[PDB]
Amino acid sequence: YRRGYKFSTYATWWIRQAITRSIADQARTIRIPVHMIETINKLNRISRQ
Amino acid sequence: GNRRIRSVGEMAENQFRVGLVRVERAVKERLSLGDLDTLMPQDMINAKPI
């Protein structure tokens, strides 16, 4: 709290990370480690760009 | 007289509108949130659901 900020921001970072990785771990028949995943998201964005 | 056809443009219009809404969800989300001066209109678009 002494940082004095809104706690929303803190737990937003934390829980964003948690969920962002838990969907990647789970959510398929095959597990796919994360280097693939981040590479894939890059692709999905720059595809559209 | 109780009975009406359905040719193509009708159905095409239907699913097209649906794709528009599939995008529209994101549209609202990215309208109110993002920067206003600089967010291009096609910086919002993904035509893939369409």
UniProtKB/Swiss-Prot annotation, chain A:
Compartments, record wording: Cytoplasm
Annotated transmembrane regions: none
Domain of life, per lineage: Bacteria
Family: Belongs to the sigma-70 factor family. RpoD/SigA subfamily.
Stated role: Sigma factors are initiation factors that promote the attachment of RNA polymerase to specific initiation sites and are then released. This sigma factor is the primary sigma factor during exponential growth. Preferentially transcribes genes associated with fast growth, such as ribosomal operons, other protein-synthesis related genes, rRNA- and tRNA-encoding genes and prfB.
Assembly behavior: Interacts transiently with the RNA polymerase catalytic core formed by RpoA, RpoB, RpoC and RpoZ (2 alpha, 1 beta, 1 beta' and 1 omega subunit) to form the RNA polymerase holoenzyme that can initiate transcription. Identified in a complex containing RpoD, the RNA polymerase subunits RpoA, RpoB and RpoZ, CRP and DNA. Interacts with Rsd; this prevents interaction with the RNA polymerase catalytic core and with promoter DNA, and as a consequence, promotes transcription from promoters that require alternative sigma factors.
Domains (record comment): Contains 4 domains, connected by flexible linkers. In the active conformation, the domains are in an extended conformation, each making extensive interactions with the RNA polymerase catalytic core. In the autoinhibited state, sigma-70 factor domain-1 packs closely together with sigma-70 factor domains-2 and -4, contrary to the extended conformation that is seen when the protein is part of the RNA polymerase holoenzyme.
Protein name per UniProt: RNA polymerase sigma factor RpoD
Organism per entry: Escherichia coli (strain K12)
Organism classification: Bacteria, Pseudomonadati, Pseudomonadota, Gammaproteobacteria, Enterobacterales
Gene that specifies this protein: rpoD
Residues represented out of the complete protein: 421 to 469 of 613
UniProtKB/Swiss-Prot annotation, chain B:
Any coiled-coil regions, as ranges: none
Subunit architecture: The RNAP catalytic core consists of 2 alpha, 1 beta, 1 beta' and 1 omega subunit. When a sigma factor is associated with the core the holoenzyme is formed, which can initiate transcription.
Family under the similarity heading: Belongs to the RNA polymerase beta chain family.
Free-text function comment from the UniProt entry: DNA-dependent RNA polymerase catalyzes the transcription of DNA into RNA using the four ribonucleoside triphosphates as substrates.
Protein name from the UniProt record: DNA-directed RNA polymerase subunit beta
Source organism: Escherichia coli O45:K1 (strain S88 / ExPEC)
Gene: rpoB
Residues of the full protein shown: 449 to 498 of 1342
